[PDB]
Amino acid sequence: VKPNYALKFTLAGHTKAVSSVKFSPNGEWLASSSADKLIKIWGAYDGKFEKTISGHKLGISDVAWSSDSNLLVSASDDKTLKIWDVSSGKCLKTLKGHSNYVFCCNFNPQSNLIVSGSFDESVRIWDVKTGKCLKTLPAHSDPVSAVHFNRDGSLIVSSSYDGLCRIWDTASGQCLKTLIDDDNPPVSFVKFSPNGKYILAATLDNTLKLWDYSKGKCLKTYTGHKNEKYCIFANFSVTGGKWIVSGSEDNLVYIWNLQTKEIVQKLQGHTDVVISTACHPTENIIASAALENDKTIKLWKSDC
């Protein structure tokens, strides 16, 4: 009925704010990106440092794995994305086109495509093999906070400070839906549920919401945590019970019962805003990461 995540590992290495953490699909590795311009690879189970990957000229806001755990795309303030062969650590491609910071990115499940969102208010679709930008979508009238493909790559969802979440048809680049609430607070994060039927979004008014994307109907609502300034990554946790994990500007990691919307746990340990969390694909492991005054990445584990 409740999880009991407890601290197991603290990973130190980044010399400025951490910005995102992601578990490789095969569950072996955790990748992290930082304002210190670096990507770092760590063992997913022992928090043991693997390697450092470099090349970006400015800080990095997001990183993301290909489905086969072998490549990584990163998005940075240097106005580019890079694609990386993880085991060799070489930059396969540099993706050029955005005219300001690239804030978020992701592979499709096929991983022949890459989607990015930028401060320039655009969402772009890139071809992995060539590095070429396939489509540029005029997605928002403010910076784009998150971008994500659904389970089959047919749909992209995107969120923005302009207050909107939009669903796009990958094939045509057509806007299929615009999610409108009552007050349209800046949307600082969005992602699909694993089946791709629902979408989780976070708003800069201390609220996470679960939406039925088709009906365009908000359903569950999760509050209690703190989010009014930073884009905090949130998650569906589904390896044990069913929960919703989010970072929080009160230095805590919050955990919710998916159904009741009640807080079932709050993890103490960090010393600055918890900017990003991730959930292990198979194990009840949660990875968390923090801003400038902490710089550490923590790994927690639970039985439920």
């Binding site: 549920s193 089946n195 629902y198």
Partner: peptide
Amino acid sequence: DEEVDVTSVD
């Protein structure tokens, strides 16, 4: 309000 299945792909 009502149950929601987030993992099932039917």
